[PDB]
Design a binder for this molecule. Structure first.
Ligand SMILES: COc1cc(-c2c(C(=O)O)[nH]c3c([C@H](C)N4C[C@]5(C[C@@H](CN)C5)OC4=O)cccc23)cnc1O
Ligand SMILES: [Zn+2]
Ligand SMILES: [Zn+2]
Length: 232
């Protein structure tokens, strides 16, 4: 009823959308992993009379539900999707998207890692993002590679029309007490990568983490704090 939806609020298999700004929504879904349930976010950005999708809803069935919820709530076609790193909460559902006529994209590093790890593989490579600090335009957003953090390949997304910063899993929510799933992380480099994000997007008004509640720019410093302390 208007609050940001939470993990106990969304059964696994259902998807909710949340209006962030004019023409910007997040999508929220839930999934089971190693015997625990987690929420996860993605982004939807209006692209004229089309939509750009950022990240799947963490699974084929969740991502089919995502497409159905978009048709219900927005009614514009999803034509392109970008996955911001190679894990299942970002690419699981890419096969569903591809069969629905969505063109799927990720960096070559993400595509290589997804293939090696047996995850679904976006079709198209996003060049121009292989060095930390790189940025490229993609429809109504800018894609930014901050350096290794939650994963070596993780990308962030900025919507300049609304000053919305989508940090993906390189950015944690304010209530976070841990650095999340650090299996593939670079804890030593993560603070440096967050500093690059902070320097590149100082006018961000909304910051959306890969999991949990959006907030403001404080999510970036909080993330650096939690990661440094996790390493401690
Ligand atoms: C520990 O508590 C939290 C965890 C998470 C969380 C995050 C995140 O932090 O982005 N990602 C997660 C993944 C994804 C699919 N996976 C799987 C994996 C393991 C490796 C294979 N060996 C690939 O690594 C990864 O990220 C699975 C379940 C939980 C998380 C978020 N909030 C929390 O509180
Ligand atoms: Zn991940
Ligand atoms: Zn994640």
């Amino acid at each position: 009823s208007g609050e940001y939806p939470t993990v106990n609020e969304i059964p696994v298999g259902e998807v909710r959308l949340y209006q962030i700004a004019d023409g910007v929504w997040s999508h929220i879904a839930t999934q089971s992993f190693d015997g625990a349930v987690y929420p996860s976010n993605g982004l939807i950005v209006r692209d004229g009379d089309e939509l750009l999708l950022i990240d799947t809803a963490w699974g084929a069935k969740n991502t089919a539900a995502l497409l159905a919820e978009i048709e219900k709530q927005i009614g514009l076609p999803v034509t392109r999707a970008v996955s911001t790193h190679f894990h299942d909460d970002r690419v699981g559902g890419v096969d569903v998207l591809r069969a629905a006529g969505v063109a799927t994209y990720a960096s070559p590093s993400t595509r290589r890692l997804a293939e090696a790890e047996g995850n679904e593989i976006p079709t198209h490579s996003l060049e121009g993002l292989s060095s930390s600090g790189d940025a490229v335009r993609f429809g109504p957003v800018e894609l930014f590679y901050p350096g290794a953090a939650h994963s070596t390949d993780n990308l962030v997304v900025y919507v300049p029309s609304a000053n919305v910063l989508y940090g993906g899993c390189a950015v944690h929510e304010l209530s976070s007490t841990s650095a999340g799933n650090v299996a593939d992380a670079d804890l030593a480099e993560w603070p440096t990568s967050v500093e690059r994000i902070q320097k590149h997007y100082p006018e961000a008004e909304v910051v959306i983490p890969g999991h949990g509640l959006p907030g403001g720019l404080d999510l970036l410093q909080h993330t650096a704090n939690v990661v440094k302390a996790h390493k401690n």
